[PDB]
Amino acid sequence: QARKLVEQLKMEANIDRIKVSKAAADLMAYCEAHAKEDPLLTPVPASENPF
Amino acid sequence: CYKQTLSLTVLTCIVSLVGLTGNAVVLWLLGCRMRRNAFSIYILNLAAADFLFLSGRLIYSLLSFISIPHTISKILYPVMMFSYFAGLSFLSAVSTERCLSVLWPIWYRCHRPTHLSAVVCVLLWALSLLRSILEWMLCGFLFSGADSAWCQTSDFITVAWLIFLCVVLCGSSLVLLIRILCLTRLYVTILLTVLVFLLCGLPFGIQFFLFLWIHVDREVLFCHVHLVSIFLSALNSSANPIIYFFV
Amino acid sequence: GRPEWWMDYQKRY
Amino acid sequence: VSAEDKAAAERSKMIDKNLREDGEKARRTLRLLLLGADNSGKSTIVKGIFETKFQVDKVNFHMFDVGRRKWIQCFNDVTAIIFVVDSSDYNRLQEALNDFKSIWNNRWLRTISVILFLNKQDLLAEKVLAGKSKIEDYFPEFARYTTPEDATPEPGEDPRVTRAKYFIRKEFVDISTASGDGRHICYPHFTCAVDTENARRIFNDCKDIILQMNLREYNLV
Amino acid sequence: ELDQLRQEAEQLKNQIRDARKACADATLSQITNNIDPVGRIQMRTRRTLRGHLAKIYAMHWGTDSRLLVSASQDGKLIIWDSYTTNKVHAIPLRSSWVMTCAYAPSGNYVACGGLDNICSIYNLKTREGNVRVSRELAGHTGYLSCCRFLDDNQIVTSSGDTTCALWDIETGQQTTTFTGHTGDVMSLSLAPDTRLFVSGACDASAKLWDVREGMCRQTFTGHESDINAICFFPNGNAFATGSDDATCRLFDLRADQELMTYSHDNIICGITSVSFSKSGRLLLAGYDDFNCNVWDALKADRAGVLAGHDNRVSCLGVTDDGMAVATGSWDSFLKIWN
Amino acid sequence: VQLVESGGGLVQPGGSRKLSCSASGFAFSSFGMHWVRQAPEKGLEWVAYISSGSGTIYYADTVKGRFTISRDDPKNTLFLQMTSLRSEDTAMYYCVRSIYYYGSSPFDFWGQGTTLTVSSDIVMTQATSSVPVTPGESVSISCRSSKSLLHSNGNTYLYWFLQRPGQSPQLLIYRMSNLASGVPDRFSGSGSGTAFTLTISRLEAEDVGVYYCMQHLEYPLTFGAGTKLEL
Ligand SMILES: CCOc1ccccc1NC(=O)c1ccccc1NS(=O)(=O)C1CC1
């Protein structure tokens, strides 16, 4: 009945967490690596856009 | 008359300027919308006809405070009158569909063909072009030495065309109130549109083509009836964007 | 013919 | 354009033709949403989706009932909403009034009108002539209410019924009149279970809804 | 006892919030202070797809980044050739109350769903030249909100019955049922590796599910209204949500908490759709106030606006190569921006 | 999917005939239809084309003016009207369905033909005219064109067909690289503009006959001479 809530809260509470500073850097490092590939950030030349 | 002629020609420059800036925005705003319902198509067409008419009122007004050549007046005429008659027929087409929306509301929103307004508007642009060609053929260069009775017949139809548009506007407006009666903004808008058309749209066009064959007076006809009609017509074109779109 | 009472604006062609 | 991109463009134009032709049929059908709590006799008016078609005076009508906090956004361009109320079960008129208030003041239904049917006015008549159950227990403001002198349209019915019948209606109209700004209207009616005029009533009210939409297209209202 | 276990729920609630505060050493706004802003993003409408005679609820891009599917209340799925604007297919629907659509990664199938509670699979490329219903997936007791293919045979569906399901399309039966949301599930997003997916419901919570095991790994709670839109970061270690509180939020899967909040005092309307760019530096969000806003995902700064629609922007997607973004609206138009 | 055709017989020169093809098993109204004939011993030649909705009709210059193509969409039938028949009008007449959208494969289905016995342009050449290939050996069939079939949209509009003895031709490659549905993966196509190849790795029986390369860049549609494989 309500033992599923405490069984779910227990499994969710037992997980290893990296720090927020480490998590932010991974997002930052992914963006820099792929910053030269997406057109919407730095526009592609007028002869490369198919639209 | 030298006192009044300058007073009314300057005042027409001001009205023509505010009218043109009010019609450029209407053409711009209505030329960008994707839906553009039946009412907007007549307003878009009437803004076009009022742009040409006010431009002709503005060119002649400026070259009148100066003394420029008269070659413009012969070439700006069958554009100003072509646009003037296109506008009066688009006011009558708005009133008629405004009445049909009330008499048969389900037919208007469910069974009225989706391109009626566009097709009616290209008919009314064409009916004005035909009327201007007819006036040029019978009163102009071609039928010049034939007689003057062929010009007078053409002026007769223009008066007949002007009255018929008045009956369409007033008849369409009248049936609307009779149906509604059998509610303040409705009565305010119907009488404002009928009065601005009657007292600022029709005077010019009726005084020009009637008094073109009835010798009235050098002073009364021109300096008190003609220039006032010219001002009133520019006023009517400069208010249609306000009466019909900005409210 | 063209009436002699016409002014400058009444001869539009 | 290549040989078979002209053919692709030509096939696209044939798709546009069928889309335009199918939307013309959709323009001639009026769409309604049917709403109301259980025990309201909702499925006996015209005597996840249960569509229903009917026509009156050669006009197609097309009615939906869902069997609401989120999906109600889909029915944002409907011609009307038909809200049905059991006007004889006084224990739950408050729920009917809060259910109607949520619909009326909903953000996506600001321009949708409501046709209000009060079913079981034959059962409201028995609950008021018998006198066993009184409005005043559930609604204190009943004892101070009086049938308007101008409003005397009750044909051949007891005076006691007409006061309770008109008091229940006001409890819904005053919600509608409070915050509607005139952009949409509530049309109230009374029906029992076997009133066969319910198609005409929706029609007459939908014709008034289209008239007001047409008046606002021309800046008259 | 029912009361005894009730305290056990709140005891662990503060134990989870204790671990989250222990791992919140710094903030994403602190680290990304010394990075160059993107500037002003000026995108222009390159295409306007016309033909829908009613409001558009959903669009999805194909994996070739040229074909897209669109759903409308007129009752039809249209497949567009975005490059040439040509219509490839127009698929009539049994029910007009569509709320979602999907495009199979292979390109062989499109899916559809709405108030009929049925996810309908359509066969795009068969003989006989037409498009046919491959399968109808019944089993949800509430309306279908979103759907995404994992393969040609597995689809994941969310619903207003507070549950998500995994279906085997060949058999037509729910392989796994995901439970745990207390409100109408409104959106889901699939991870790039397709071993996880996130959900967003009307209980203002986001839940990270395991597609294989069948359970709920994590629950994220920072919003204060209905979560309407959800999307993974391209990295697969974070996701973004959009709610009715005029707020976007970025949650880190590994830190188990929210990293950034995308709010502005000028926006007061809800968020209908959300998507990322290819790098993950752009967060695009469609709003109820008729326009789309581009956000720098790392600095919480508006970088532009996509204001070209005459009604509510309902759906929004970015191509797999990042070349373009498509928006759909209640004004019945689709626009490709680049 | 069937396309059965009727008509045929001997017609004297200057006569007239009507050739009819009936479809069964597919959405006939959404397919464009082609007439392609082959002379009793010669190669494949394209006659006429009618679009879906009958909005676009093309003819070859040989039969232009005296041949009319028509369709009856409700009754699922395609027609061809013969007027002023000539001794060069004797051939097996084939009916071919084509559908043109993004990603489609035109010329998918040919129909068993009928025989009539009446008693500039992109010339593209298959220099090899006969090749004996041992089974299980890779073989390359090549043809070239007068001009480039590579278009500005990146599509190269070359098609490969196979005609087994006593059979209607079937499609192998559409747009120079893409395998047709129901074709073994051992078939591959490659080449640039004006130079093309078809590779049959691990050749087997029931993989012999005459191989044709058609251009679809512009009308009229042109076929190759035919490079045949014999055991
Ligand atoms: C004769 C005095 O004309 C004016 C006096 C003051 C302002 C404007 C005008 N004319 C005009 O607008 C005007 C514009 C274009 C062409 C002719 C015009 N001449 S017209 O009189 O309208 C006459 C044709 C009816």
* Cα-based radius of gyration of chain D, to the nearest Å: 22 Å
Gyration radius from CA atoms of chain A, angstroms:
21 Å
Kindly estimate the percentage of residues of chain A that lie in beta strands according to DSSP: under 5%
Strands of the widest sheet of chain D, in order across it, are: 2-3-1-4-5-6
The multimeric state of the shown protein is heterohexamer
Helix count, DSSP H or I runs of 4 or more residues of chain A: 2
CATH topology of chain D: Rossmann fold
Tally the helices of chain D: 6
Biggest interchain interface, per-side counts = A-E, 38 and 62 residues
Family (chain E): Belongs to the WD repeat G protein beta family.
Keywords (chain E): Acetylation, Disease variant, Host-virus interaction, Intellectual disability, Phosphoprotein, Repeat, Transducer, WD repeat
Modified residues (Phosphohistidine) (chain E): 264
GO biological process, one term (chain E): G protein-coupled acetylcholine receptor signaling pathway
Key words describing this protein structure:
heterohexamer, B: 247 residues, mainly alpha, 11 helices, globular, D: 221 residues, alpha/beta, Rossmann fold, binds 2-[(cyclopropanesulfonyl)amino]-N-(2-ethoxyphenyl)benzamide
In short:
The complex is a heterohexamer of chains A (51), B (247), C (13), D (221), E (338) and F (231). Chain B has 247 residues and is mainly alpha-helical.
Please provide a written account of the structure:
The complex is a heterohexamer of chains A (51), B (247), C (13), D (221), E (338) and F (231). Chain B is globular and about 55 Å long. Chain B has one domain (1-247). Helices cover 81% and strands 0% of the residues of chain B. Chain B has 11 helices and no strands. Chain B has helices at residues 2-30, 38-65, 71-75, 77-103, 105-110, 116-138, 149-181, 184-200, 203-210, 218-237, 240-244. Helices cover 7% and strands 47% of the residues of chain E. In chain E, a hairpin with a 4-residue loop joins β27 and β28 (334-337). Chain E has helices at residues 2-22, 28-31, and strands spanning 45-49, 56-61, 67-72, 76-81, 87-92, 98-103, 109-114, 119-123, 132-137, 144-149, 154-159, 163-168, 173-179, 185-190, 196-201, 206-210, 216-220, 227-232, 238-243, 248-252, 257-262, 271-276, 282-287, 292-296, 301-306, 313-318, 325-329, 334-337. Chain E has 2 helices and 28 strands. By secondary structure, chain F is mostly beta strands. In chain F, β7 (67-72) and β8 form a beta hairpin. Chains in contact: A-E, B-C, B-D, B-E, D-E, D-F, E-F. Chains A and E meet through α1 and α2 of A and α1 and β17 of E. The structure holds 2-[(cyclopropanesulfonyl)amino]-N-(2-ethoxyphenyl)benzamide. 2-[(cyclopropanesulfonyl)amino]-N-(2-ethoxyphenyl)benzamide is lined by residues 9, 12, 56-57, 60-61, 64, 73, 76-77, 80, 208, 227, 230 of chain B. Chain B: It is a multi-pass membrane protein.
